[PDB]
Ligand SMILES: CCCCCCCCCCCCCCCCCCCC(=O)O[C@H](COC(=O)CCCCCCCCCCCCCC)COP(=O)(O)OCCN
Ligand SMILES: *[C@@H]1O[C@H](CO)[C@@H](O)[C@H](O)[C@H]1NC(C)=O
């Protein structure tokens with residue numbers, strides 16, 4: 001049946017320079033990982049040892065790079081367009097492998113202050129607004145996300161490649 | 173021109189508009205007028 005890895009990240013920004021993160025991931029309905037801490041010291045844990053020490057440390061390294069880049073982008077939208085703080089952002093993302101064997105379905109949705117904001121469309125690796133309220137913030141955030149390899153193709157690859165291999169290896 | 177997270181670097185006429193092509197908003201972020 002539908003094998004899947006889901007990841008959840010909630011980021012509470014007191015101001016542009018300080019964030020508290022809280023997240024987790026699950027394989028099907030089983031909780032597998034938790035993430036929590038200030039930007040300066042975010043703890044990332046696999047609740048069971050699904051990955052051996054070296055391979056886990058490589059995952060942890062990529063996640064910590066991601067968190068600094070995510071914080072960077074939020075700081076950049078503030079510096080360029082002004083955001084109102086405090087604000088909370090929720091990213092919910094994952095990969096889902098159909099039993100029939102068609103291509104994995106992936107997603108990466110961002111909400112701000114509990115409302116839909118933008119989400120990723122993996123067919124052409126582009127982000128779109130989920131809200132119909134137009135604003136300089138949404139326009140600029142989409143311009144940035146759709147401008148770079150990192151936030152388009154590397155992001156797609158994490159979902160369709162890294163996430164899918166992890167599902168195939170660790171459930172089975 | 174912009175590359176991923178380059179815009180957190182201070183603006184630079186040389187880096188941005190002479191070594192690369194800059195758009196009007198990148199130029200204005202240098203002029204600070
Ligand atoms: C899949 C197996 C992995 C192992 C299992 C994971 C263990 C989970 C443990 C923790 C719980 C999960 C919570 C965190 C979610 C992590 C998501 C990480 C994705 C990631 O690293 O993306 C990299 C791109 O990042 C970027 O592009 C950086 C910025 C991305 C922007 C995101 C959108 C935010 C919008 C904010 C804008 C401003 C808002 C204005 C109010 C590309 O992945 P890769 O580096 O692995 O490379 C792959 C290609 N080779
Ligand atoms: C999973 O993460 C989100 C953090 O935003 C949270 O709301 C949900 O409570 C978390 N689950 C657990 C079991 O901590």
Ligand SMILES: *[C@@H]1O[C@H](CO)[C@@H](O)[C@H](O)[C@H]1NC(C)=O
Nearest residue numbers: 083084085086087088112113
């Ligand atoms: C998010 O909500 C907070 C707390 O209610 C508010 O002060 C802030 O202006 C909001 N920020 C947004 C919508 O970007």
Ligand SMILES: *[C@H]1O[C@H](CO)[C@@H](O)[C@H](O)[C@H]1NC(C)=O
Nearest residue numbers: 147148149150153174175176
């Ligand atoms: C995307 O990033 C830069 C474009 O500025 C380039 O060095 C790189 O080759 C591009 N990616 C691919 C796979 O071509």
Ligand SMILES: [Ca+2]
Nearest residue numbers: 173174178188
């Ligand atoms: Ca540049």
Ligand SMILES: [Ca+2]
Nearest residue numbers: 173174188198
């Ligand atoms: Ca620039």
Ligand SMILES: [Ca+2]
Nearest residue numbers: 179183198201
């Ligand atoms: Ca600039």
Ligand SMILES: [Ca+2]
Nearest residue numbers: 187188191192
């Ligand atoms: Ca350059």
Ligand SMILES: [Ca+2]
Nearest residue numbers: 179197198201
């Ligand atoms: Ca700029």
Ligand SMILES: [Mg+2]
Nearest residue numbers: 080197198201
């Ligand atoms: Mg500007």
Ligand SMILES: [Mg+2]
Nearest residue numbers: 186187190191
């Ligand atoms: Mg030069």
